[PDB]
Write a protein that binds this ligand. Structure first.
Ligand SMILES: Nc1nc2c(ncn2[C@@H]2O[C@H](COP(=O)(O)OP(=O)(O)O)[C@@H](O)[C@H]2O)c(=O)[nH]1
Ligand SMILES: Nc1nc2c(ncn2[C@@H]2O[C@H](COP(=O)(O)OP(=O)(O)O)[C@@H](O)[C@H]2O)c(=O)[nH]1
Ligand SMILES: Nc1nc2c(ncn2[C@@H]2O[C@H](COP(=O)(O)OP(=O)(O)O)[C@@H](O)[C@H]2O)c(=O)[nH]1
Ligand SMILES: CCCCCCCCCCCCCCCC(=O)O
Ligand SMILES: CCCCCCCCCCCCCCCC(=O)O
Ligand SMILES: CCCCCCCCCCCCCCCC(=O)O
Ligand SMILES: CCCCCCCCCCCCCCCC(=O)O
Ligand SMILES: CCCCCCCCCCCCCCCC(=O)O
Ligand SMILES: CCCCCCCCCCCCCCCC(=O)O
Ligand SMILES: CCCCCCCCCCCCCCCC(=O)O
Ligand SMILES: CCCCCCCCCCCCCCCC(=O)O
Ligand SMILES: CCCCCCCCCCCCCCCC(=O)O
Ligand SMILES: CCCCCCCCCCCCCCCC(=O)O
Ligand SMILES: CCCCCCCCCCCCCCCC(=O)O
Ligand SMILES: CCCCCCCCCCCCCCCC(=O)O
Ligand SMILES: CC(=O)N[C@@H]1[C@@H](O)[C@H](O)[C@@H](CO)O[C@H]1O
Ligand SMILES: CC(=O)N[C@@H]1[C@@H](O)[C@H](O)[C@@H](CO)O[C@H]1O
Ligand SMILES: CC(=O)N[C@@H]1[C@@H](O)[C@H](O)[C@@H](CO)O[C@H]1O
Ligand SMILES: CC(=O)N[C@@H]1[C@@H](O)[C@H](O)[C@@H](CO)O[C@H]1O
Ligand SMILES: CC(=O)N[C@@H]1[C@@H](O)[C@H](O)[C@@H](CO)O[C@H]1O
Ligand code: NA
Ligand SMILES: [Zn+2]
Ligand SMILES: [Zn+2]
Ligand SMILES: [Zn+2]
Ligand SMILES: [Zn+2]
Ligand SMILES: [Zn+2]
Ligand SMILES: [Zn+2]
Lengths: 553, 553, 553
């Protein structure tokens, strides 16, 4: 039990002294190592990455003068900008005014060919989001030239009027926005900001000269991406200020700096029915003479959306371990490829065609030696398994099918090469129809099992193997068999029928080992009737019938 | 050195021709491959996934008429909606009005059983967030029926008044919001939007008919998730418009489309003390007659939060390599399982009980052959390691413990099977108390080391192995030992005491190899005293004392 | 073909009964298993993690009284807070007022040493964001003491005036904000909220006593992180309420609770030129006597940014499979380490120096046995490969280089150990200048190939190996060679020149196997001229020239 615990299994290997294969192995190992290292360091797969949480604080500075009796106006942050001071801020670039609005009946603004021509056309009680009123069903003259439906809404109405061109607040392109970005990686417990001590304040952002200046001129934002602020100012738009944080929190590779990029977020070619641009209608309410009045301003502008994103990486042992474990199996590529080469070039097909056709692959025949020193083929031992050898042939035949009452001599199997004998050890001092030697005899086994023993020493007519002197020296010589038995059992009693049986079995084994060198084939070999019966004649049984070949399993 | 570099180690293998094991191996390989492929393609583990950055632009369109002297009002986007046009927008569904507010003393609104009954109950200088004023400590009659505390706050007060039921702006359910969603994957450098050219504009969203229409009717939003807009309109709520982007950026599998889903974000059963619903109090300031007055509107509505989330996948070679490396080791499952089967069925326990009990597992005994052709057991060579063989027994005994002065014959070890001899090679032409053969002699070694040599040829009384003829043929025959020595050293000088010593050692080795076939056991074998001293008698030393067994290590 | 499919390859192994190595293997296996399990469960690597989508709803409650003719004011949520009720909300802590603003010429506010001293200093048409007006180029006296430039802007101007100290709305520290957080994991289809049924309402958040109370006192927020609300109230700031959701959605380990933490998001030491603190200028517009007037309020306060982040993990089989596959290769660590130990201690370097220097590593010499039972070295069979043995030496010499016309006897290779012979099997019954034995003869091969056969039996002068009796018994004995041939071919015809050739080849093989035990070396061995020519003399050819050694490949 404890001995079972205290065991270590190590694979048997074959140390090959080959320049080609060693060079290939080291080249592939180096390639795998290089790619693994490159992937680890480039993608920082050894680091735990966490997304950031951002806080944005914007301050827009800039004033515009608008001339529109002539009225001279001044526009500051309490005028053209909203209380928006975070991820988004709005800069007004144009506007439409409608002073003194009261909820009453009035003609809807004639625009986009909405002028009415017939009273029946207008509907009663119909909600009109385009005009923002309820039509009363009666057409009325908005102007002496054209007529429009009557809506109970805020009056006077100015819906559908185009934004003035050129934009009144074009000067917004000269306005400067300061962006303060605070990010944190709570898992990594790291916080930083885009404005650090020792940074100049009289700077404006540029891709090259001042890439870290958080002060942006809107016109520069637009022209860095090929957008015409003057055109966008008319109907408005949405622009994006991307702030990317590719941040490394490792001490030896610490750099957490923002990268500023810009992107228009509103489609230039939005259909006129999809409300192009960016605008919003905001109203100031007041009391006049005793009635509640409203002043409506339709403000066109650019909404700047500050989009902050990024990841913060810090070394994590678990991630590195996982990556290494993932990539470890790639170091078996050399083994796989070289074993594939050995297996393929060990095939008896290359010599036939490939080598004569291509003579450059001639020295690759050495892989047969490697294969035979690397692989030990074996077959499943099954009852039908049988091996036969014919002295007129230089190979052994394996039969792995049932004998359906037909002689094993006539049964056909497949050819296999007889194993090489141990030279170091060998260097020492009315006959049956199926019989082609004349010495074979009918089987005494039951009828259903006579086919197994119906085998001859040779396939073609000739002399029996029993005529060879080695048959008598090895198989029939009682002295040699006695020596073998004593070698196994030194104090054996060479008397009785037991010794005759043991000698018979040793003779069978001797023939099997002589003609089927491998013990694997010798165990499942089948002796010819001639040799079997000569053996039995030499070492015969008493008051018993021979059983024959047993299944080793 | 370079020869050390130019080496390739390949494992020795056993090619088994088994239908069952090959079928099992291929089945398991196919299963592993199928699961790995399924996981790779379903979860898109070959792709690098990046979260998106979103910009949302909303446009709500819809007008409501409210009747509340009778006052007829019109409510448009400058009235019921806020400047919110991004990720969130607010649609007012009800309201409470309080015109003409001045900062002075007044009775707090009697609500939720807040009516005061005693002057002492009211506190002086106490902040009252429920009433939003500082109590003066004196109770006053709010109405002829009930009394309330006096607060220096905006007056007249209307706190705690329930939202009117039914909701005044019920018609908000018919209002339509257009959502424009712009997403980007900056790492993958991909941008898209939810409105593409060629999409109809007179559409409203439906799960099946118009799943890609970014125009939503609020009532439809509510009824798609079993929410009653009429009820929510009273106190308000929060609704979520989820926009999911499961986007594949690979050219051959490119589809980046949004999936719209809805979710109520406010708890229906919020406790009345936790401010249920959604409302906000916004005030319009003005000057009246010389004093600064305020108009307060408590607006109840639905805040729609557009929640945009998703990931964009693009093929990455590094991710695929990592996944493949992770899954490569799963291809050894076939080897593990089949080797486990071989090891288990090679145990000498199955034959004893399992096979007779269950006869279906009879042909699985072939795994003993596979085990013995796959594993070569070996023991750690240690000084205490000793092997002994008794000619009255068919096994060898291994002793791996110290001899505490007691004879090795009486010491007990564990039984091991003597290895099979090479048949191919063999096929060729006052006695001591511990002695059970009569031919053994006392050891001449030092007293502490006599136990090692205190061993007999047999455990039970009988004839000595020295009486066998093979002992003289193999161990004592000077001709055979001389032939062996010459085989090792052809030009050996067969004269002197050196040749006698060499013959003695060869005789020891011959006995050890004969009775312990394996060289591993023969190296650590222990000769019996009888055989040892017969050998020494045949090849005796001169002017010296025999040392005995040395430790091969 | 199908037999090729029905094959299973299993590695040959060596079962070592070693306490040290088994203990090491199990220790390393346990260590790897423990670390893998720890990483899996601690980091929850078996779970699929999804980021959350959050909705935040805030309700600030609290009223302040400000005394500033003396004016007594009341400040409620319609006064000090914005319509912000989501991820951010603003609490006003101080303010500056400027009533009755009109767009006209006026002197800019003298602050930060901006007082003008010369008319020429002021510029005409110059935008002044600091003063928020267009300078007319003429200096005018703002006050009797100091003068400032003239700006066409809103007047009276109050830019650059410091926030009053102490802060007017200090009482904001006593105000309470209720945060309702709704999160969802749409991939995992899980939603939850920070307020659950059965939670008290009269609670305020504390780290220990009430960590789950979503009602926060602002002063407590500030003092939990060492911030002085009274100081921040003057100029304002930005504070962050982090809500972390480390949520496990597995039923057996379900806990999805928020963790509240606070963080100041505005730099305390922001440069005075970077607009420290948080403020915004919001204006109320009105009509007075017929002209449009403006009231400007510069509000200083704290903007609270609710930052919600977290991940939701649920068991995923794919992730667990990937992690296990990643970590499987780490279970080969025991094999790697033990094989490294075996390889290192099998080196013939330790015995020389390490063991005598350090005697504790003495019993580690057993690894040579393990190495020789684990590895079978083999060399690449190449035409230049040759083996030679000298009977005056105890080793075989391998030559793997071309013979540039110089005798192979004088060519130097590298020494290798002759393999141990099978004891079990052996236990059975004007001479050439390069010649150091006298029996060698010149080669009859072509001139370019005579060097191969120019080899002697010994390196130093002495007796030829042919004088040994084993040479005649093994190599020249016709009986033994005939027996070997018959063993290979039992019915061989021992007549003709074919038998002589076969005997010659068998004699070459016999010498090669005798002196180069391994068949690998015997195949590429080179016979000495003396032995070769004695053999040929014994078994000579007829009407033909001998070819010599062939390349087995
Ligand atoms: N390999 C092989 N073994 C055989 C053959 N015939 C008999 N044997 C072996 O010899 C034994 C049977 O001996 P047998 O002649 O029947 O003598 P008996 O059993 O005493 O009657 C079995 O254990 C077989 O393994 C044969 O043709 N081939
Ligand atoms: N395996 C084994 N070897 C032995 C035994 N006795 C002696 N030897 C070997 O024989 C050698 C010692 O020979 P020994 O009889 O002492 O002759 P001496 O050394 O010349 O006195 C050692 O190298 C041992 O390996 C034994 O019982 N078993
Ligand atoms: N290993 C080895 N084999 C040899 C040597 N000389 C001859 N042979 C073998 O003997 C065969 C050639 O026999 P050879 O003497 O030329 O007789 P021939 O071919 O009939 O003229 C070849 O197949 C060689 O493998 C030698 O020095 N070493
Ligand atoms: C999975 C690929 C395996 C390929 C094996 C091919 C073996 C060829 C044998 C030969 O030609 O000698
Ligand atoms: C890398 C595999 C190369 C295989 C080439 C096979 C050439 C034929 C050899 C035989 O079979
Ligand atoms: C088939 C793959 C290419 C193999 C090249 C064989 C070269 C030799 O012959
Ligand atoms: C990459 C491996 C294939 C290239 C090496 C081929 C070597 C063939 C030699 C023979 O066989
Ligand atoms: C870790 C599992 C290892 C199981 C090995 C069981 C071996 C049984 C031997 C037998 O019954 O023959
Ligand atoms: C898959 C493993 C099956 C093991 C069954 C073992 C049956 C007993 C064999 C012996 O031991
Ligand atoms: C124990 C696992 C089941 C093994 C089945 C054994 C079948 C035979 O016997
Ligand atoms: C899944 C592997 C177990 C099923 C195969 C069992 C085969 C047993 C044959 C004997 O042994
Ligand atoms: C990669 C590391 C490999 C180290 C192998 C060292 C072998 C030493 C041989 C010895 O000293 O016996
Ligand atoms: C774990 C590796 C330890 C190596 C120690 C080598 C000691 C010298 C042995 C020889 O070579
Ligand atoms: C070199 C690494 C340490 C090896 C320790 C060797 C101990 C013995 O000797
Ligand atoms: C961790 C492995 C190294 C420690 C074990 C060393 C054992 C040396 C024994 C000899 O060789
Ligand atoms: C570079 C460019 O095309 N600029 C144009 C400008 O010419 C045009 O006057 C203006 C009107 O919107 O739009 C912008
Ligand atoms: C609350 C409300 O006004 N709902 C209206 C409904 O009455 C009307 O039938 C429908 C068709 O116009 O539009 C919606
Ligand atoms: C389907 C349903 O229950 N609808 C109800 C409606 O019956 C009720 O009049 C209204 C009042 O809030 O709330 C909603
Ligand atoms: C700045 C401010 O008003 N702080 C007050 C403090 O004076 C008072 O003692 C406490 C208890 O009501 O509440 C808070
Ligand atoms: C603990 C602490 O330093 N508190 C200070 C307080 O002393 C100071 O009066 C106030 C003025 O801003 O700022 C805060
Ligand atoms: Na692996
Ligand atoms: Zn016959
Ligand atoms: Zn015959
Ligand atoms: Zn005895
Ligand atoms: Zn004895
Ligand atoms: Zn010579
Ligand atoms: Zn010689």
């Amino acid at each position: 039990s404890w001995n079972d615990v205290f065991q270590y299994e190590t694979n048997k290997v074959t140390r090959i002294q080959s320049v080609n294969y060693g060079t290939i192995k080291w080249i592939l190992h180096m390639t795998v190592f290089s790619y693994v290292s490159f992937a680890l360091m480039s993608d920082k797969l050894y680091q735990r990455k966490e997304p950031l949480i951002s806080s944005v604080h914007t301050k827009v500075k800039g004033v515009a003068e608008v001339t529109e009796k002539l009225v001279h106006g001044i526009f500051d942050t309490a005028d053209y900008t909203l209380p928006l001071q975070g991820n988004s801020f709005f800069v007004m670039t144009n506007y439409l005014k409608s002073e003194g609005q009261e909820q009453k009946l009035c003609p809807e603004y004639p625009s986009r060919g909405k002028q009415c021509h017939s009273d029946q056309g207008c509907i009663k009680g119909w909600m009109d989001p385009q005009s923002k009123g309820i039509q009363t069903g009666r057409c009325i003259p908005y102007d002496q030239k054209r007529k429009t439906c009557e809506i109970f809404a805020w009056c006077p109405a100015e819906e559908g009027k185009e934004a003035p061109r050129p934009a009144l607040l074009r000067s917004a392109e000269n306005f400067t926005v300061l962006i303060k970005n605070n990010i944190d990686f709570p898992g990594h417990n790291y916080t930083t900001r885009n404005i650090l001590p020792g940074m100049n304040i009289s700077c404006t952002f540029h891709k090259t000269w001042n890439p870290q200046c958080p002060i942006f001129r809107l016109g520069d934002i637009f022209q860095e991406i090929g957008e015409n602020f003057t055109e966008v100012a008319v109907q408005g738009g949405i622009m994006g200020i991307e702030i990317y944080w590719d941040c490394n929190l490792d001490s030896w590779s610490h750099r957490c700096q923002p990268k500023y990029s810009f992107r228009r977020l509103d489609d230039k070619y939005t259909n006129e029915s999809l409300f192009p641009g960016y605008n919003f209608r905001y109203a100031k309410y007041y009391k006049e003479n005793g009635m509640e009045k409203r002043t409506l301003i339709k403000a066109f502008g650019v909404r700047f959306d500050i989009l902050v994103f990024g990841t913060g990486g810090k070394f994590d042992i678990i991630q590195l371990v996982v990556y290494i474990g993932s990539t470890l199996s790639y170091f078996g590529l050399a083994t796989v490829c070289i074993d594939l080469i050995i297996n393929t070039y060990a095939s008896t097909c290359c010599r036939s065609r490939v080598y004569p056709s291509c003579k450059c692959c001639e020295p690759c025949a050495v892989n047969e030696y490697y294969y035979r020193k690397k692989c030990e083929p074996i077959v499943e031992p099954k009852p039908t398994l049988k091996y036969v050898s014919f002295v007129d042939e230089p190979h052994i035949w394996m039969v792995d099918q049932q004998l359906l009452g037909k002689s094993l001599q006539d049964v056909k199997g497949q050819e296999v090469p007889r194993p090489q004998t141990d030279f170091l050890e060998l260097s020492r001092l009315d006959s049956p129809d199926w019989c082609q030697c004349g010495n074979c005899l009918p089987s005494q086994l039951p009828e259903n099992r006579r086919a197994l023993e119906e085998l001859c020493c040779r396939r073609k007519p000739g002399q029996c193997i029993t005529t060879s002197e080695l048959f008598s020296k090895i198989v029939l010589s009682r002295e040699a068999l006695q020596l073998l038995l004593l070698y196994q059992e030194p104090l054996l009693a060479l008397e009785g029928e037991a010794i005759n049986s043991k000698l018979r079995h040793c003779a069978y084994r001797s023939y099997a080992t002589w003609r089927f060198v491998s013990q694997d084939m010798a165990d499942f070999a089948i002796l010819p009737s001639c040799c079997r019966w000569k053996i039995r004649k030499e070492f015969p049984k008493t008051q018993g019938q021979y059983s024959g070949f047993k299944y080793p399993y």
